Amino acid sequence: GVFTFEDEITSTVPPAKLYNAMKDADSITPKIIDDVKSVEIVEGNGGPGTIKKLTIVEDGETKFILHKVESIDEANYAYNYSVVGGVALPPTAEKITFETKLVEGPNGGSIGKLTLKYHTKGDAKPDEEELKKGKAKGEGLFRAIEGYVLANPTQY
Template sequence: SFKCVENVEGNGGPGTIKKITFLEDGETKFVLHKIESIDEANLGYSYSVVGGAALPDTAEKITFDSKLVAGPNGGSAGKLTVKYETKGDAEPNQDELKTGKAKADALFKAIE
């Protein structure tokens, strides 16, 4: 469950870094979330995980590009692209990728 969200740097626009504090398995943890871009005209939002519990040791950052697109029957659908940037020549660990995806899905649903 989420405990709090606070701006560490910036005013809410691109470049802003937010600290999201949450409870996981009885432990208080945090993640640093950097807003990369906001595209209101095309309903797009891009952010990166740049620190904290959700960033594996092998990753420099993990960027999530989300966009709402027209769906069938006048509805909409969400499209999410994930870019995983490793540190140096490190290879991404498949278990870390699966765990990260599950955490990102949970965050996306909580924000929905």
């Protein structure tokens, strides 16, 4: 089955602008996040079903993570993807889905609605520790994109 967790975060960047930057996560992420070295398309054209391979060098040792693009809704500022392979994925999980939806902020910013879905093998409830890592990962990407936009205002 599926275990679901919601999280909400705010930004000072307006949603249309953040969303445009998200589309460039593949090039933005390696620059901002020290451990991320590259993001490469294994299969597909960037649309749903696309598989991406992230190369990371935590410590001094290389690691791969695999993402699958699930859906996009540009009009509603949504990007959804799943972790589908790599040591990030525990054996009790078929996949971990990260959904991001941006809405308008009261003062010219955005509200990020982050949804985390764990598809477990035999309805294995996620660990306090596992979730913690998942919450941090989703929050980390959002901050990486936001940070790039705030640091490079002419870009978007």
